[PDB]
Amino acid sequence: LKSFTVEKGIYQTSNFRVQPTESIVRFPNITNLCPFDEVFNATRFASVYA
Amino acid sequence: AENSVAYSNNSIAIPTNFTISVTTEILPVSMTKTSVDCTMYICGDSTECS
Numbered sequence A: 001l002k003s004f005t006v007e008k009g010i011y012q013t014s015n016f017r018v019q020p021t022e023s024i025v026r027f028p029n030i031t032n033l034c035p036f037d038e039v040f041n042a043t044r045f046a047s048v049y050a
Numbered sequence B: 001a002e003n004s005v006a007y008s009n010n011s012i013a014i015p016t017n018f019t020i021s022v023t024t025e026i027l028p029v030s031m032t033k034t035s036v037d038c039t040m041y042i043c044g045d046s047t048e049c050s
């Protein structure tokens, strides 16, 4: 009210807000891993020119 | 509908009976009381915007 004396009544002061606690992140099942064991674990490394 | 009242300078028409009718009038008196919140509407749950 920008005043020191408040007349009898009901006044809108603030806006109550429930605030979040956790940050949920959901993504599908992690499948189809990219093929790298065939290139990282292999004794048949190609030639430098080939 | 067209109508020509039988007007003449010495004749009168006087009712001999009556009907007690009931009319209906409908008047709005109030609307929906609404309230708004800028901190949730314009810049919804984002302190950077507010």
Ligand SMILES: *[C@@H]1O[C@H](CO)[C@@H](O)[C@H](O)[C@H]1NC(C)=O
Pocket: B008, B009, B010
């Ligand atoms: C009154 O009405 C009659 C209709 O019959 C008409 O002839 C007469 O002229 C009227 N009176 C006057 C003063 O005009």
Ligand SMILES: *[C@@H]1O[C@H](CO)[C@@H](O)[C@H](O)[C@H]1NC(C)=O
Pocket: B016, B017, B018
């Ligand atoms: C007026 O009308 C009602 C029906 O609406 C009837 O019963 C009654 O007899 C009438 N009155 C006269 C004086 O004719």
